[PDB]
Short mmCIF file of all heavy atoms in Angstrom, two decimals:
data_model
loop_
_atom_site.label_atom_id
_atom_site.label_comp_id
_atom_site.label_asym_id
_atom_site.label_seq_id
_atom_site.Cartn_x
_atom_site.Cartn_y
_atom_site.Cartn_z
N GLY A 228 20.60 35.91 44.85
CA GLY A 228 19.42 36.08 45.67
C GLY A 228 19.15 37.48 46.19
O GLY A 228 18.01 37.92 46.21
N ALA A 229 20.21 38.19 46.60
CA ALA A 229 20.06 39.54 47.13
C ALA A 229 20.62 40.62 46.20
O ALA A 229 20.60 41.81 46.53
CB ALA A 229 20.73 39.64 48.49
N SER B 50 3.08 41.34 33.77
CA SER B 50 4.53 41.21 33.92
C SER B 50 5.16 40.64 32.66
O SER B 50 6.30 40.94 32.35
CB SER B 50 4.87 40.30 35.09
OG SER B 50 6.26 40.01 35.09
N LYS B 57 9.80 44.52 25.69
CA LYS B 57 11.16 44.88 26.05
C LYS B 57 12.15 44.05 25.24
O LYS B 57 13.13 44.57 24.72
CB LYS B 57 11.36 44.64 27.54
CG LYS B 57 12.75 44.91 28.05
CD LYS B 57 12.84 44.48 29.49
CE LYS B 57 14.26 44.56 30.00
NZ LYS B 57 14.38 43.91 31.33
N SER B 126 9.41 30.31 54.12
CA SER B 126 10.56 31.06 54.62
C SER B 126 10.68 30.98 56.13
O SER B 126 11.76 31.16 56.67
CB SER B 126 10.45 32.53 54.22
OG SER B 126 10.28 32.67 52.83
N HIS B 147 13.14 27.22 47.57
CA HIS B 147 12.91 28.60 47.96
C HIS B 147 13.30 29.64 46.92
O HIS B 147 14.45 29.70 46.50
CB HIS B 147 13.68 28.84 49.25
CG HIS B 147 13.27 30.08 49.98
ND1 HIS B 147 14.05 30.66 50.95
CD2 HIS B 147 12.14 30.82 49.91
CE1 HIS B 147 13.42 31.71 51.45
NE2 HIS B 147 12.26 31.83 50.83
N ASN B 150 12.00 37.23 45.59
CA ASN B 150 11.26 38.32 44.98
C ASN B 150 12.22 39.41 44.47
O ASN B 150 13.12 39.85 45.18
CB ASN B 150 10.28 38.88 46.04
CG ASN B 150 9.47 40.05 45.54
OD1 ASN B 150 9.09 40.12 44.36
ND2 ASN B 150 9.16 40.98 46.44
N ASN B 197 17.98 34.50 53.56
CA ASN B 197 17.24 35.15 54.64
C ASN B 197 18.00 35.16 55.95
O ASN B 197 17.86 36.10 56.74
CB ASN B 197 15.88 34.49 54.87
CG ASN B 197 14.91 34.74 53.74
OD1 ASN B 197 14.87 35.83 53.16
ND2 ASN B 197 14.08 33.74 53.43
N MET B 233 19.47 48.26 46.78
CA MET B 233 18.50 48.98 47.58
C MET B 233 18.99 49.20 48.99
O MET B 233 19.59 48.31 49.59
CB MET B 233 17.17 48.21 47.66
CG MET B 233 16.40 48.08 46.36
SD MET B 233 14.87 47.11 46.51
CE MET B 233 14.20 47.27 44.86
N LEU B 238 14.37 48.15 50.82
CA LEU B 238 14.23 46.71 50.70
C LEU B 238 13.16 46.21 51.65
O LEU B 238 12.30 45.42 51.25
CB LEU B 238 15.56 46.02 51.00
CG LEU B 238 15.52 44.50 50.78
CD1 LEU B 238 15.03 44.21 49.38
CD2 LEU B 238 16.88 43.90 50.99
C1 3HC C 1 11.48 37.29 52.04
C2 3HC C 1 11.84 35.99 51.29
O1 3HC C 1 11.57 34.91 51.79
C3 3HC C 1 12.83 36.02 50.11
C4 3HC C 1 13.24 37.36 49.48
O2 3HC C 1 12.57 37.83 48.56
S1 3HC C 1 14.63 38.31 50.19
C5 3HC C 1 14.83 39.81 49.19
C6 3HC C 1 15.34 39.40 47.80
N1 3HC C 1 15.25 40.49 46.94
C7 3HC C 1 16.22 41.52 46.96
O3 3HC C 1 17.19 41.45 47.73
C8 3HC C 1 15.90 42.84 46.27
C9 3HC C 1 17.20 43.56 45.87
N2 3HC C 1 16.93 44.39 44.78
C10 3HC C 1 17.23 44.00 43.47
O4 3HC C 1 18.01 43.07 43.25
C11 3HC C 1 16.95 45.01 42.34
O5 3HC C 1 16.76 46.30 42.94
C12 3HC C 1 15.70 44.63 41.45
C13 3HC C 1 15.82 43.19 40.92
C14 3HC C 1 14.39 44.75 42.26
C15 3HC C 1 15.64 45.57 40.23
O6 3HC C 1 16.18 46.86 40.55
P1 3HC C 1 16.30 48.04 39.53
O7 3HC C 1 17.68 48.15 39.03
O8 3HC C 1 15.92 49.29 40.21
O9 3HC C 1 15.35 47.69 38.34
P2 3HC C 1 13.93 48.33 38.11
O10 3HC C 1 14.01 49.79 38.14
O11 3HC C 1 12.95 47.87 39.11
O12 3HC C 1 13.50 47.86 36.68
C16 3HC C 1 14.54 47.76 35.69
C17 3HC C 1 14.92 46.28 35.42
O13 3HC C 1 14.46 45.35 36.43
C18 3HC C 1 13.43 44.50 35.87
N3 3HC C 1 12.30 44.25 36.74
C19 3HC C 1 12.24 44.59 38.11
N4 3HC C 1 11.09 44.04 38.69
C20 3HC C 1 10.44 43.34 37.66
C21 3HC C 1 9.30 42.51 37.65
N5 3HC C 1 8.62 42.27 38.88
N6 3HC C 1 8.87 41.89 36.45
C22 3HC C 1 9.54 42.06 35.21
N7 3HC C 1 10.71 42.86 35.25
C23 3HC C 1 11.15 43.48 36.45
C24 3HC C 1 13.08 45.06 34.47
O14 3HC C 1 12.61 44.15 33.47
C25 3HC C 1 14.28 45.93 34.07
O15 3HC C 1 15.26 45.51 33.11
P3 3HC C 1 16.00 46.67 32.32
O16 3HC C 1 16.99 47.37 33.17
O17 3HC C 1 16.72 45.99 31.23
O18 3HC C 1 15.08 47.69 31.76
#
Side-chain angles (χ1 to χ4, degrees):
Chain B
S50 171
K57 177 187 173 190
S126 305
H147 196 198
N150 178 35
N197 290 322
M233 293 178 176
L238 184 54

